[PDB]
Each structure stands twice: as C-alpha cells, then as structure tokens.
C-alpha cells in the first residue's frame, strides 16, 4: 500500500505522479525506435477528488510529463529499471530547491520554464548522443521531467542520477568551473563545503589507466556541449576518505560500480585511500569555455 | 501483462482504462472500519489530456469520474467480490454487448448505461441500500451495485452502473422472462418473439403453463428474499422493477456442447453458488433437469406499496 506521505504536498504529488506515469508506461509497448512526435509529446493528468483520498494528497492537482517515451528510453540507456526508478521515488518521501530520493540514488531539481524550454531545445540531439556514446558519458543523466500544479502554482522538475555514491559519505565537495571564485565565509560555515577552482588549487590520483578513460569521456562530452552553444557548467567532484569512514554488512571503499556510476577508486601508489566521484553538472543555461574547462580537469589527474 | 485497453469503441477503452485506474488507486487506500457520511457524497475525478502519446487505443483527451468509491468498494466486499477480480473482468479483454448493454468478456458483470436521473436516484437510495445489504448480509434478489461511473469522451458524458450478472457466467440461458405482475397486457412483441433469445413477459409465461419447480428449501429462501426486498423498495418510493427469470435446459446444454466437440474434431447442470448467485436447481422429482436464475432488476392506479404486494404475489406464484 503506497501512501504518498511527504513533508510538502508538492512532494506527495511528485510521488503520486511518478508512480502514476510509470504504471501507465508499463502498459505502453517499448517501441523499435523513438519517433519525432515522441520528442514533442507529453502526458497530462488533472485530479479532482471530492471527500476522498484527502489524507496524504491534495484533492486537486495536475501532473504533466514531458516526452515520456524519450525519457523512458534514456532511463533504459542509462541501465536503470523503470520499477526501480519508481521505487526510489515512491517508496519513501524524497528528502533535503534540491532533493534526493530516500535512498539517495536520484536527485530531483526544481527548475524554471526556461530550463524546460532549453531541455526541449537540446533533447533530440542529447538523446542521439547517448545512443552514440552507448550511455558512457559524464554528462548529467536525464531520467524524467515534470510539471506539477499544486494550488494553482506550477513547478517544474528534472530527475537525474546522483553524482555521489548512494551510500559512501562525501567529505569534500568541489565545484570546478575552470576568473576567480572561492568559497564564502558564510558558506564555509556549513558542514559540507562547496569549494571552487581557486580553493582547489589553494589546498586526485586515480591512476594512469582510468585517466585514459575519464579524459577520453570528458573531452567528447565537452565537445558536444560546445556545439550546443551550451556554456557555464561545472564539473562536480566528490571525495570519500575511507580511513575516516572506519572511525551482513558492507565494507570501507566498497561500492557498486553499476549503481555509483561515477565512483573511482584510488591508485595503490597514492597518499590516502579514497573513492572519487566526478561528472558534469548544470548544463541548461562555448569553445573557449570548453577548452578552458577541459584543460582544468586534465590538470587534476595523474 | 500489458493492458492495451483495446476495444471496439473509444468509450469502452476509456471504461477499461478507468476501472483499471480507480481499482489501482483504491489499492493504495486502506479499508475503513466503517463508512462515514461524506463517503456517500464523495467522488473521484480524473482528466487526461495526453499529447502525441499513448494514442493507439485511448483517446488523447477523456474524463473519468467514480461515485462514492469507498462505498462501492465496500459493496463489492459484501457481495463477495475481490477488487483484483473485478478489475480483471473489466480490463483483461474488452467488454462485449448484447455501449450500451455490455457484459464483461467473461460474463461475470453487466455494465448498463443510465441516465443522469438514474445517477441521482442512486444517490438518493445509496445510504439506505447499503444499510440494507448490511442487515441482510448480501442475501437479496436486488441488483448488486459494484460501481457507478461517468465517462467523458468527445465532450459527451455517459453514465454507467456495474452490476453482477443475474445469469450464469458459464451455463446457457435458453429462455427468459421479464415479469412485473402488472394488470396491463404484458407480452413480447412480434419482433421480440422472433428474436434469438426473446424476452417474454407476464402473459407469455401465464398462457404457457410453465411453472418452475425448485422444491421447498429453495422456494423458501427465495420467497423470503423477495418479501424483504420488495418491502425495502416499497419503503423507498420505488416502482416498475421486474423479476428477471432465465431458464437453463441441462439436457439441451449437454447436446449443444456435444455438437461443438464433434465439429471441433476437424459438472453437468451444476454451478458454484458462490458465483452464480441467483441460480437454483430444479426439484429432485421434476420433469426436465433445469437451472433457473431469478433476480429483481430495474430499480432506478398504482402506488409503490400496492405494486410491492402485487408483484410479490405474482412472483410468489411463478414457482411451485
Ligand atoms: N547529480 C548530482 N548529484 C549530487 N549532487 C548534485 C547533483 N547535481 C547537482 N548537485 C548539487 O546540487 C547543487 C546546485 O548548485 P547551486 O550551488 O546552489 O549553485 P549556485 O549558483 O551557487 N546557487 P544559485 O544562487 O541558486 O544559482 C550543488 O551542490 C551540487 O553539488
Ligand atoms: N457539463 C458538465 N461538466 C462537468 N461536470 C458536470 C457537467 N454536467 C454535470 N456535471 C456534473 O456531473 C454530475 C453527475 O450528474 P448529477 O446526476 O445530477 O449527479 P447528482 O445526482 O446531481 N450527484 P449528488 O448531488 O451526490 O446526488 C452533476 O451534478 C454535475 O456535478
Ligand atoms: N444483471 C443482469 N444480468 C443479465 N441481464 C440483465 C441484467 N440486468 C439487466 N439485464 C438485462 O435487462 C433486460 C431487460 O431490461 P433492461 O431492458 O435491458 O432495461 P431497459 O433497456 O431500460 N428496458 P428494455 O431494454 O426495453 O427491456 C434483460 O434482457 C437483460 O438482458
């Protein structure tokens, strides 16, 4: 029995909604190819309950899903099962605009109508690239996109794969832009600092073989982004120090590569034993920035 | 596994979609200790406007509304009907027709199109009808109401009520009567009489000498329901409802089926009573071995009191 209990009503609708669309999809055959109309398509449902089912949901709400077929394809191409995706959103309320699913597998980002429009502008080209690179990318993985309507207010959301491990704690964020920007004495007053380029140089050893696959990947992504006149991303980086973690059951530095899709173990010949997470984030908003950024990352490996 | 909701008309698709939708929704909703007053004023409404998506069987745009869902789920429970079952009967394959007199593909349930006025009359009587199904434990010749819906397709509204079938989902009806016990000439038409399975009326039955012989403990259970049922209806300003009577001929049912097997080369007279709920066997010492099906239908200078009494006498006499 899926109650849709959640702190905010808007969260209840997101749960209700992901549940609804995925069940509905399980009844729509998986086609032999996507079609052009699939990229212009959506699903809209308006609910009006009167004296019924009022416990966790609002009685009146709308739920809209953009290009359901495309995103179910992307999901597949990212090795994510629909039932799993559904369980991660519905089984428990997502948690703390930036959300994670209760199990930390997926990130839910609130976005503007301009973003949704930008998404539409890039989606076919972006899909074709996921095909061509067989899902092996450092680009953000777009899992679904929705418009919720609660109390006449519209809210747009994109679901992506979390960059960080869903289990392994993180101990240092780095948002790497590639001009100077640092961390705020106000932001450094928080438990998990979001440091930038300048702070990174002021303060990663994966080997020479993973670099030969990371950079292979990263450079092709950055190319594709340029040609989309997309600029202003970051590369998000995470660090998990194993030793500190220690201070039936899993173990230290133990992770599932098919789940924590961005996770990289450290070399043997390397200072502390740690697990890194790296992927490209925030792409919804060219060549200079791609050369200037691609070079910054390459200068952070050995 | 995949439910296409494929059907002869878009309206039936939407019917399938909607029964599927609501039963599924309902599965996420606990089962209450009691119903509350508002449960009887309650409804669910859904509006779908898909665009370029999922258009093979459903329309892109439709509405589905279910009346007092909690109250019908409860009716279903008291009539010994699982919601998953009910749902599979409506959604596994398209219902078939006889819009706008359908049966589920498996002949368990009947879907009747009704009027707006009918839907109103259901609301009027619903609180009373429910309480009646309570004190009578589900034992009644009255219609078993399992659901009530409004469909909107092409901006047209269609009202439908689901009942349990009076007839067997398995055994074959070879003859049927619709009886009111009226004073007026009730006979089947020239057109009716030439139909495949004509719906005969009071005077046909009478001028035909048929009695039904069910034998005592059956006759008693039946007549007791009838008295209680019709007295309930008369209480609720209800008139013009009929006793629906189907006859099944076992012998003819053993030969007809023996014709399919033969041409296909190129128990008998019994039924689960928990399923065929209005069926009674013919009396041990009767001519033909027969199964009857009898229920009241159509409840949505004569007044209701007199019609209740009258109807009851005629009915109480249709069978020895
Ligand atoms: N896939 C992901 N996995 C884990 N964390 C993520 C993921 N995507 C985004 N984030 C986080 O979500 C964040 C959004 O960044 P936002 O920093 O607050 O930038 P900002 O410009 O400084 N704030 P704003 O004023 O709203 O523009 C960062 O903390 C990211 O680490
Ligand atoms: N054109 C419409 N658009 C949307 N809703 C409508 C429309 N027309 C009728 N309705 C609603 O559909 C209903 C269902 O039919 P209505 O039969 O008379 O039921 P009711 O008996 O009035 N329900 P209740 O008051 O609980 O006894 C109406 O009351 C309206 O709520
Ligand atoms: N529960 C039921 N099971 C099987 N048949 C039913 C059931 N309820 C009603 N019927 C049908 O109802 C019939 C006669 O009345 P019903 O007519 O179809 O309403 P009506 O269309 O308003 N009046 P009419 O069509 O002229 O007889 C029978 O022939 C049955 O086919």
Q: Do domains B1-165 and B166-319 have the same CATH topology?
A: no
Q: How far apart are CA B69 and CA B145, in angstroms?
A: 12
CATH superfamily of domain region A163-301: 2-Layer Sandwich (3.30.810.10)
Residue of B nearest to A41 (CA): B52
Q: Does the CA dihedral B212-B216-B221-B225 come out positive or negative?
A: positive
Instruction: Supply B177's token pair.
Output: 């009567």
A13 touches chain B (CB under 8 A): no
CATH for the stretch A1-162: 3.30.800.10
Q: How far apart are CA A89 and CA A15, in angstroms?
A: 6
Instruction: Supply A225's token pair.
Output: 């982004």
The answer to whether the CB of B276 falls within 8 A of the CB of B224 is: no
Nearest to A70 by CA among A20, A157, A143: A143
The answer to whether the CB of A73 falls within 8 A of the CB of A42 is: no
Nearest CA owner, ligand 2 atom 30: B116
* Alpha-carbon distance A24 to nearest alpha carbon in chain B (angstroms): 9
Nearest to A167 by CA among A278, A252, A264, A266: A252
Exposed, middle or buried: residue B106 (CB in 10 Å: 0-12, 13-18, 19+)?
middle
Residue B166 Cβ < 6 Å to ligand 3:
yes
Q: Does the CA dihedral A207-A209-A212-A214 come out positive or negative?
A: negative
Nearest to B174 by CA among B109, B245, B114, B237: B245
Q: How far apart are CA B214 and CA B315, in angstroms?
A: 14
Residues of chain A contacting B32 with CB distance shorter than 8 Å: none
* Alpha-carbon distance A144 to nearest alpha carbon in chain B (angstroms): 15
Q: How far apart are CA A182 and CA B231, in angstroms?
A: 85
Give helix A82-90 / helix A68-77 axis angle, nearest 10°: 100
Domain ranges (residues) in chain B: 1-165, 166-319
Cβ distance of B48 and A44 shorter than 8 Å: yes
Q: Which residue in the block uniquely carries the two structure tokens 């003859």?
A: B175
Q: How far apart are CA A73 and CA A123, in angstroms?
A: 12
What single DSSP character describes residue A37?
Answer: G
Q: Which residues contact B200 (CB under 8 A, 6 or more apart)?
A: B175, B176, B177, B178, B187, B188, B192, B193
The answer to whether the CB of B242 falls within 8 A of the CB of B177 is: no
Nearest CA owner, ligand 2 atom 17: B116
Cβ distance of B4 and A24 shorter than 8 Å: no
The values of phi and psi at residue A24, to 5°, are: -65, -45
- Cis check for the bond before B100: say yes or no (omega within 30 of 0): yes
Residue in A3, A24, A52 closest to B43 by CB:
A52
Q: Which residues contact B6 (CB under 8 A, 6 or more apart)?
A: B13, B56, B57, B94
Helix, strand, or coil (residue A280): strand
Q: Which residue in the block uniquely carries the two structure tokens 């429970």?
A: B77
Helix, strand, or coil (residue A194): strand
The answer to whether the CB of B109 falls within 8 A of the CB of B164 is: yes
What single DSSP character describes residue A180?
Answer: -
- What positions of B carry a catalytic annotation? 112, 240
Q: How far apart are CA B115 and CA A186, in angstroms?
A: 67
3-state secondary structure A229-274: CCCCCEEEEEEEEHHHHHCCCCCCCCCCCCCCCCEEECCCCCCCCE
The answer to whether the CB of B109 falls within 8 A of the CB of B165 is: yes
- Ligand 1, from A107, A259, A276: best to mutate by most atoms within 8 Å of Cβ? A107
Q: What are the angstrom distances between the C-alpha of A61 and each of A11, A48, A71, A147, A201?
A: 12, 7, 23, 11, 48
B220 in a labelled binding site: no
Nearest to B230 by CA among B184, B296, B284: B296
The answer to whether the CB of A44 falls within 8 A of the CB of B50 is: yes
Q: How far apart are CA B138 and CA A272, in angstroms?
A: 73
The experimental resolution of this structure, in angstroms, equals: 2.7
Helix, strand, or coil (residue A43): strand
Q: Counting every residue, how long is chain B?
A: 320
Q: How far apart are CA A222 and CA A217, in angstroms?
A: 9
A163 in a labelled binding site: yes
The values of phi and psi at residue A26, to 5°, are: -70, -10
Residue in B53, B54, B70 closest to A52 by CB:
B70
Q: How far apart are CA B169 and CA B271, in angstroms?
A: 10
Nearest CA owner, ligand 3 atom 17: B298
User: Which residues does residue A241 pair with via DSSP β-bridges, in sequence order?
Assistant: A274
The answer to whether the CB of A192 falls within 8 A of the CB of A260 is: no
Instruction: Supply A162's token pair.
Output: 């979390």
What single DSSP character describes residue A191?
Answer: S
Cβ distance of B2 and A27 shorter than 8 Å: yes
Does the domain formed by B166-319 have CATH 3.30.810.10?
yes
Q: How far apart are CA A147 and CA A150, in angstroms?
A: 10
Pairing verdict, β B175-179 and B199-200: parallel
Q: Which residue in the block uniquely carries the two structure tokens 């998506």?
A: B53
The values of phi and psi at residue B173, to 5°, are: -90, 125
Give residue A291's region: left, alpha or beta (phi > 0; psi -120 to 50): alpha
- Ligand 2, from B157, B159, B161: best to mutate by most atoms within 8 Å of Cβ? B157
In this structure, what is the dihedral angle of CA atoms B180, B181, B187, B188, given to the nearest 10 degrees? Answer: 30
Interface test with A, best of B4, B19, B24, B52 (most A CBs within 10 A): B52
A64-90 per-residue burial string, b: 16 or more CB within 10 A, e: under 16: bbbbbbbbbbbbeebebebeebbbbbb
Q: How far apart are CA B50 and CA A67, in angstroms?
A: 11
Q: How far apart are CA A235 and CA A224, in angstroms?
A: 15
The answer to whether the CB of B121 falls within 8 A of the CB of B300 is: yes
The values of phi and psi at residue A30, to 5°, are: -80, 120
Contacts 24+ apart (CB under 8 A), B31-34: B31/B73, B31/B77, B32/B70
What single DSSP character describes residue A39?
Answer: G
Q: Which residues contact B313 (CB under 8 A, 6 or more apart)?
A: B181
Q: How far apart are CA A127 and CA A130, in angstroms?
A: 5
Q: How far apart are CA B243 and CA B230, in angstroms?
A: 11
Q: How far apart are CA A99 and CA B69, in angstroms?
A: 34
Q: Which residues contact A57 (CB under 8 A, 6 or more apart)?
A: A4, A9, A12, A13, A16, A47, A49
Cβ distance of A1 and B28 shorter than 8 Å: yes
From start to end of chain A, where are the E strands?
A: 42-50, 60-66, 98-100, 106-111, 142-150, 153-161, 172-176, 194-195, 234-241, 263-265, 274-281
Helices (H) and strands (E) counted in chain A, each on its own, are 8, 11
The answer to whether the CB of A77 falls within 8 A of the CB of A132 is: no
What single DSSP character describes residue A141?
Answer: -
Residues of chain B contacting A4 with CB distance shorter than 8 Å: 28
Question: A236 CA to middle of ligand 1, Å?
Answer: 9
Helix, strand, or coil (residue A98): strand
Q: Which residues contact B240 (CB under 8 A, 6 or more apart)?
A: B180, B298, B307
B186 in a labelled binding site: no
Class of domain B1-165: alpha beta
Residue A151 known to be catalytic: no
Q: How many CB atoms lie within 10 A of CB B83?
A: 16
A47 in a labelled binding site: no
Residue in A46, A50, A69 closest to B43 by CB:
A50
Q: Which residues contact A88 (CB under 8 A, 6 or more apart)?
A: A101, A102, A103, A105, A106
What single DSSP character describes residue A215?
Answer: H
The values of phi and psi at residue B205, to 5°, are: -45, -55
Q: Which ligand is nearest to the CA of A48?
A: 2
In this structure, what is the dihedral angle of CA atoms A42, A48, A52, A56, given to the nearest 10 degrees? Answer: 50
| DSSP-assigned letters across all residues of A156-178 | EEEEEE-SS-SSS---EEEEE--
The answer to whether the CB of B304 falls within 8 A of the CB of B224 is: no
By what method was this entry solved? X-ray
The answer to whether the CB of A166 falls within 8 A of the CB of A260 is: yes
3-state secondary structure chain B: CCCCCCCCCHHHHHHHHHHHHHHHHHHCCCCCCCCCHHHHCCEEEEEEECECCCCCCCCCEEEEEEECHHHHHHHHHHCCCCHHHHHHHHHCCCCEECCCEEECCCCCEEEEEECHHHHHHHHHHHHHHHHHHHHCCCCCCCCCEEEEEEEEECCEEEEEEEEECCCCCCCCCCEEEEECCCCCCCCCCHHHHHCCCCEECHHHHHCCCCCECCCHHHHHHHHHHHHHHHHHHHHCCCCCCEEEEEEEEHHHHHHHHHHHHHHHCCCCCCCCCCCCCCEEECCCCCCCCEEEEEEEECCCCCCHHHHHHHHHHHHHHCEC
């Amino acid at each position: 029995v899926k109650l849709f209990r959640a702190s905010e009503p808007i969260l209840s609708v997101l749960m209700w909604g992901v549940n609804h669309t995925i069940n509905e999809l399980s009844n729509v055959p998986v086609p032999v190819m996507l079609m052009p109309d699939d990229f212009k398509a959506y699903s809209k449902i308006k609910v009006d309950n009167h004296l019924f089912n009022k416990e966790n949901l609002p009685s009146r709400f709308k739920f809209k899903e953009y290009c359901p077929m495309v995103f179910r394809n992307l999901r597949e191409r990212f090795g994510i099962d629909d039932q799993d995706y559904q369980n991660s959103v519905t089984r428990s309320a997502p948690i703390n605009r930036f959300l994670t699913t209760y199990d930390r597998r997926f990130v839910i980002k609130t976005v503007s109508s301009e973003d949704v429009a930008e998404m539409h502008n890039i989606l076919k080209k972006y899909h074709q690239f996921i095909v061509e690179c067989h899902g092996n990318t450092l680009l953000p993985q777009f899992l679904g996109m929705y418009r919720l309507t609660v109390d006449g207010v519209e809210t747009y959301m994109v679901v992506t794969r979390n960059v960080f491990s869903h289990r392994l704690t993180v101990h240092r964020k780095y948002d790497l832009k590639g001009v100077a920007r640092e961390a705020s004495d106000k932001e450094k007053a928080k438990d998990l600092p979001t440091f930038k380029d300048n702070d990174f140089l002021n303060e990663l050893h994966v080997g020479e073989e993973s670099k030969k696959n990371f950079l292979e990947k990263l450079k092709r992504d950055v190319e594709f982004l340029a040609q989309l006149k997309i600029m202003d991303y970051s590369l998000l980086v995470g660090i998990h120090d194993v030793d500190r973690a220690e201070q039936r059951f899993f173990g230290p530095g133990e992770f599932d590569p098919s789940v924590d899709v961005y996770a990289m173990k450290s070399h043997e010949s390397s200072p502390k034993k740690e697990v890194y997470f790296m992927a490209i984030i925030d792409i919804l908003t060219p060549e200079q920035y791609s050369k200037r950024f691609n070079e910054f990352m390459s200068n952070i490996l050995t």
